[model samples]
Target chain A: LIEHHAASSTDQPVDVPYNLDMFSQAAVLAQETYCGEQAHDYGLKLGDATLLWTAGDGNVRQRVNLYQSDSLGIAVAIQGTNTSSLRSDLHDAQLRPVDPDSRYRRFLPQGTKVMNGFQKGYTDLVDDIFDHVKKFKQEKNESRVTVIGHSLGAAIGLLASLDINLRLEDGLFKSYLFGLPRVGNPIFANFVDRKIGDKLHWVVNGRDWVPTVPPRALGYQHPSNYVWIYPANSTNWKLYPGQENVHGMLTVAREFNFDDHEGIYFHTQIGASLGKCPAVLGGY
Target chain B: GALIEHHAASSTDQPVDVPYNLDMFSQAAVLAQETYCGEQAHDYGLKLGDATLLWTAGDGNVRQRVNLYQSDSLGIAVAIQGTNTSSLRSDLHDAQLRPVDPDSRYRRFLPQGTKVMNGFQKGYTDLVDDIFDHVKKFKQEKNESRVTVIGHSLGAAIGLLASLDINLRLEDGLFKSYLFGLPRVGNPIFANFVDRKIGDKLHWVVNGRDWVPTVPPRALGYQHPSNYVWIYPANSTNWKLYPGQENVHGMLTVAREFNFDDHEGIYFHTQIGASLGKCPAVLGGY
Candidate 1:
C-alpha cells in the first residue's frame, strides 16, 4: 500500500527544489555509520514522492527508500545479506571499545576527538536541514520533520533527530530515538530535558546491547523522558537473560498498539512509512 | 679530668657537707640534679670537702648555681621548678584573631627531629652556661649552695628539667623551681610529676585564660592536681585570672619580665647553662 501511494501521488503545491547534494550528504552519513568507510558512485534517486538508493562492494548490494507525504517524512535505508554473510560482517565489524580519539570530548576531562567529530557532523547535518527550512520557510507552513532507520541506520536516524532538536530552537522537531547508547554527557541529556523536554521521545527495548557502550555511566536519561517498549515473548532475541527485546530488534510483528505504548510505533504504522518512501523519490 | 672539690659552711644550723671531689661540670652532676628536681626535694645533702653545707631552694632558672661561701667551704647547686607561666596575661584577643594557614614557608619551620638540632643547641645552650658560672661563687657561703632556679615563660620549662638534673648530684643541693607562665614539655611524666611534686620545690603559675599549660597536659593525661603544684593568679574579681579568659599565645606581651634574679642574664645566657647543667655540649664546648 505504501509503495502504491508513493507511486500515485505526484501533486504537492510546495515549489522548493530538492537539492540533490543534500541527499548525497545524507547517504554519506549512512555509509559511514554502516561500514566506517565511505563508498564511491553511490547514487540517490528521487521518483514520485519516493527515493531509492544503493551502495555496496561487488560481493554485496544494499538499497533503501525515503517517502514523504505532506510535511511528514521518513527514511528507510536497508542492507540485504544472507544470514551467514550478515553474521560474518557483524563478526568482522564487531563493535569494539571506541578509541579515545573517536569518543566525545566536549567537557572536562576533555573527551576524545572522534566522538567530538561525530558530534560536529551530527550538528552540521541539522544545520543543513535548518537552512532548508529557513530558505523554504517550512516552519511558517507547519511542516513536520521525522526520520527513521533500521539497525545502524536507526542509530543515524536517532542522531539526526538529536541534531535537529539541538540546533533549531524556534521550530517543533521531535525525534523517536530507538535503540541508542548513552551519548554525550549527562549534562547534554539534562539540557534537552530542561530546554526542550517535551519535544523528544526515546524508545529502547530491554537488553539492547548497543546501549551498553558509551554506557549509562557516561550519562543518564530521566526515566520520565523515555517510554520503553519491551518485547512480550521469550523468542525476541534474548541478548541477556531477563532483559526482553533489548537486543535492538523492534519486530514489525509483535508491535502491540495501545494508547500508552502508542507513542513510539503507532506513528510508524499510520502512513509515516508510506509517506517517507515515495517522498525521497521526488514529488509523487 | 677537671675535678673541683668545693666546701661550703652554712649558717642555717643544718649540718650539711659539700662534696669535695665532685665535678659540678660533669654530666653525672646534671643528671643527678635533674633526678632530684623531678622528685621535688627541697634539701639534698652531699660531701664534697671538709665544709658542712646547706643549699637554699631554687629561684626559677633550671640550674641554680649559687655559692654559699664562708672562709673555708663553698657550696653551689641548681634548683628545679614547676612551670607557672599560664598565669601571665595574653596579649592576643579574639576580635583581632585572623586565620593563619600554614603556607610552605610556615610548614618549612615545623619541627622535624634531627633537622632542627643545630638551631636548638646553638640558639639555647651557650647563654645557659653563662648564668651557671656567673653565680657560682658568691658571698653567701653556707647558703651559697642554695641556687634558686626560675624561668619566665618558655624559659621556665627548660629551666625546670635542667635544674632537676643538676640537683641529683649535689646532695646539699635544694631546688626551688619557680616556673612563671610556662608551657608543658613533650613527655608523659611531665604532667604527672607536676601534680605530684607541686609544693616541695615546684611552683607553677598561670593567668587568665592562658591556654598553653592546659592544652598539652590534657592529652598527656595530667588534668587538675594528682601530681604537683599549679598556681594561677588568685581568683580576681578585679582582673579575671582564671584560664580561658585570654589567648595563651599572647601572654608574653602582658608580663614582659619574670620575677627572678637575672634580667639580662637569663635572655643573653644560653650555653653556660648547658655546661653548668651537663646537657649535651654543642660546638665541642666552643
Candidate 2:
C-alpha cells in the first residue's frame, strides 16, 4: 500500500518559510549537545537559549534548552540520541499496542502501539517539561512556542509536541524534527499530520539510516511534509508534496553515509549554509 | 596454589561438618538438573546411576526447569535453572535491584533489615510455591527424609532464596543448598540473615572470576556469604576454602575468568569430577 517516485530534477524546492538557518542551527545545537559529560558545557555555549533542566535515569537522558528570541517567541530545543539512547530505540521495535486509557491515548491513533521504552523515557520527562513550560509562559508572557529535536531526540520531540498540543491548542505551537523515525502507525501518522498541519516539518538527510528504522514492516508510519537534502552540501533540496497520506519519500543517494544523521553534519551541511543565521552566530 | 582451610560452625540444630563431601555432592546435584532431557521431565529425563528424575515443569521465560533426583547416598536432590536468555530486558530487570517493602513476605526471613533485588525476588517467588508443592509430594512418596537444593547462575540465586524459605518451613537439618556462581541477592542485612538462618547449610562456590557472583554489585549493597569455596583459576580443579573472617565484606580474590559463560553447570561438573573423581553415573550409562 505504498508508492515510490523517481528522483526528478524538475521537483520544486520546498520553502520552510521560517528562518531555516535559525532552526537548522537549533537542530545542530541539539546534536552537538548530546555528549553526555559535556551537556552543561554545550548548553552554556547556546547564547540565545538558557539551559533550563537536565535529567537522566540510567540510560534515559535528556536536556531542555529554552530560547526566548524576538522572532521565535519561546522555542524549546531538546537534546537527543546518545550512547544509551539506542536501548529505547531497539525497545521500540517490539511493536506492542498502546493502551487506550493512557494519558497519551487521545493523541495516538486507534489500535496504534508505540515503542514502550521510548514512551516510558518520554513520559518520564513530559510532566516535568509541561510544568516548566507553563511557568515559563506565565513569567515571560509568551504564548507561541516551537519544538525541535534530532534522531531519538526528534522522536521524543514529536511526542512532547503532541503532549503540549493536548494542553495548548495546535495554533500556538510548531515542531521541526530532524533525522525523524516513524513515530507510530497509519492512524497515528494521520492524526499528527492533521493536528500539526503546515506547522510540522520532518527533515531527513538523503543518506541517514535512522529515519528508515523501527522498520515499516512492524507497522510504523511517518507524518507528512518531508524535506529531503542530497549530499548535505547540495542546493538540490527536495520537498515532497504535502498530503495527509504521504508515504515517506526517499531520495536516491549515490552513497549512504550513516554520519549524515549527526546533528553537526546537518548544521555544517544545511544549517551553516544558511548564512548569518542568528542562532548560529549567537552561539559562535 | 596453596590450600586455605576455612571453617565456621553453625549454632543451629543442623551444622555442616564434612565441607569437602558437601561441596562435591552439591556439585553433582547441580549437574543432575543441568541435563535438560526434554521440554518436560517425563519426556526423557535424567538417569544419574542410582538417582532418577522425578518431575520438571514450565518452558521459555517462565520455564521452571527443576529436577528431583533420589540418590542412594545423598537421598533427595533438587536443582533449578538460571537466566536462559542474554537479552537486554533480562539484564535490565536483574540490574534494577530495589529495596524490599516493610510488609513483604520475605521481610520476616530478613530480620536485621535489608534491601532485596526486586527482580530476583519475584523470579524466586514465582517458581518456589509450585516447586515446593512438588517437593512435598515427592518427599511423601519416596519417604525421602533429606533434601539438598542446587542451582547455578540465576538458578543459583533462586536456589539460595528457596533454601532459606524451605529451611523456615521444614525441619532445620532437612534442607541444605549448594549454589554455584550465586549472584548478589540483597544488602548486608539480608546476607547476615541468610548466614545466620541457613548458615553452613548454604555453600556458595565461586569459580575464578565468575562474574555472576559479584553482580548486583557491592556498590548496590549486595554482600557475599560468609563461607565461600574459591577455585582460584577457573580452568583449574584446585579448590580453596575461603573462611568467613577473611571474606572482608564479600571481597574475595578476583578470578581470571570473569566471563558469564564460566558460570555454566558443565564447567562446574568438569571441575568437581576432576577434583573429586567420577560423579555418580546415570543408570543408562555415561
Candidate 3:
C-alpha cells in the first residue's frame, strides 16, 4: 500500500477525457506540418495561437514547429508524413535494445529497447528540438506545454516529452499525440509512466492502423493512457489506463480498417494531400 | 496519394489474448436474463433482437426455465435461467451438492466414473432430449454451424451438463459454452473429460465478488471447468483471461469484499436479474 502511494501523490481516476477542442487542436497542428502555410494558418486560427519557429521550412528532411497561445500554452508541433497510410519502413522496423547506460536508461529497467528506425528519427533531431524546448513556460497551467505530433511526428514527440520531463526541475507538459506507433518495449513504457505518464494522451481514431504497431508479439508495447475512438469517427471515446491495455487496442482489433489508418479523431483529417485547411483535416 | 489495400480487423499480427467478443457475451448475458422472461425475451437486443425463439421448457419456481434462441450472428444459443430465489424448488435444487455417478441419460455419453452434483444435473435431465433434438435440427438447417451453450448461476450448471452431453453425443465439434457465474458443475473426472472436449472454447466467466462460483465447493470433490475469464473490481468492467482450471485469480483473491450485487450486473451496466426481480414475469411467470 505504501509502495503504491509513493509512486505519485496526484494519482487519481480519470474517467473523462479532455474536450473536443483539445483533440481538434492537436489534429490540425499535426496536419499543419504537411500542408505548409494554408494548414498552419487554419491550425493557428482554431487554437488561436501563432507559430514562433518552424524547422527551416521542412528543408532538412525533418520538420518541427513551435507556437504560443495565451488561452492554451506553449506548443511544440512536429511535422510528420504527408500521407496517412502506414509506411512500409515503420511497419517493418527491427527492434533493438538501446544501450542500457544511455540517456533513455535512467529510472528505467532492463529491456528498454525501441524500433530501430523510430529511435534513429528521434536521435537525429533530439538536439535541435530541445534547443528551443528550453524557452517554454517550464511549468503547468497556462504555461503547460502541449507537445503535438502524429505518426512519425508523434514518435519524436513521445521521446521529446521524456527529455523535457528530465530536463526540467519538474514535469510541465502534456503530450497530445495522434496516430502514435508503439515507440519502445515494456521497460521503456515503465520508465515513461513513472516520469511523465499523467501528461500523455494518445488519441487513436476508429481503425487507425498506426497505433497498433511495432508489434506486441515482437517485444514492443504501447505506454498506457490510450483514448480510443472505437468506431473511428464517432463520439464513442474510452480511456484505457495501463500499459498495453488489451481492452483499448487488442479488443478494438476486430474493427480495424486501413481507411481509418489516417485521421478523423473527433472529426479531423490527418494528412496534406487533401486541399483546404482545418476542414481538410476534418475540422468543423 | 498512397495505394491502399484492405487490412483484416485485427492488430495485423496480434494474437488472441481473450475472445474479446463483447457482442457475443453481452447478448449471452441478455439471453440468460430473458430466459425467465419467456416470450417477452424479444424486448431484449441483438441476436435476440431479430432472434427466433424456437424452444422453451419448464414453469415458474418448480422447474428450471430453459430457452433456445437462434440468429444470424448469435448462431444457436441454449440459455438457462438462474435460481428463482423466491421458490423452494430453486433453493432445494441449489443445495443438492451430493456427488454421484451420472444418470443413465448423461452416463450413456460420458467416460466411466464421470460424476456430477445431484441437484445441478438432476434438474437438467428433464429437458435434455428436447434440447438435443432442437440443437440437432439447428445444425441440420445449417443456418448456423456452431452452437453457443450458455447460462448463469443454477442455469449455468444445467446448461454446462447439456453442453457436455450434446458435445459427446453429437461429436460434430460445434459447441462452445459461455457460462457466467458458474458453480462447480461436475467432479474432477467430469472436469477432465470436459477440458479435452471443449478445450479453450469454454468461457467460464465470473464477476468480481460474485461468490456463486465458489459454491458446491471443491472440498466436496467438485471442480469447475477451464478457461476462467474474470471480470474484476466487482463494480467496473475490467476483465482478464486466466486459462487454467487451477487458476484462482478469478475464483478468489478479488472477493475480499464480496458484493452479491456483482452477480446481477454482468455487463452493459446490469445483468437481467437486477431488474428482472421486480418484473412481474420472473416472480410468477417462467
Q: Pick the candidate with the highest TM-score.
A: 3
TM-score of each: 0.27, 0.43, 0.47
Can you write out model 2's per-residue Cα lDDT over B1-286, one digit (the tens) per residue? Answer: 1111112221112222335664355445434344343334564345654566777665525665667777665567777765532431246443356646422544565575666777677777777777778778877888987787877667777777777777777553345687776787766666777778888677777766666675654434456666777665664555656655225212232311145445543333443221222333222111
- Candidate 1: tens digits of C-alpha lDDT, residues A83-121: 222223432123221332222222213321112322333
DockQ of each: 0.01, 0.01, 0.07
lDDT of 2 by residue, A1-284 (tens): 11111111223456545556666555644544444454444335453555544445235556665655444556666666632344234643343435432776865566655655456657867767666677777677878777777777788788777767766643336787887766666666667767775678677766666665554434466766677766554445656654322212332211234456653333442221232322343232
- The candidate, 2 or 3, that scores higher on TM-score is 3
Candidate 1 Cα lDDT to native: 0.31
Rank order (by DockQ, best first): 3, 2, 1
Candidate with the greatest DockQ versus the true structure: 3
Provide the TM-score of chain B versus the true chain B for each model in turn: 0.36, 0.76, 0.79
Worst 10 residues of 1 chain A by lDDT: A1-10
Listed per candidate, the RMSD to the true structure in angstroms reads 29.7, 18.6, 17.0
| lDDT per residue as tens, model 1, B1-286 | 0101111111112211221222222221222223223232323343223222234333434433322212131234332222322222231122211112222222232223201112112212434455444435442434455544544344544555434433443334434554443444422233333334432555434433344343222211212211122222322212212221112222222221223221111111122122132222121121
**Model 3 clash pairs?**
A206-A232, A268-A281, A269-A281, A269-A282
Provide the lDDT at A122 for model 3.
Answer: 70
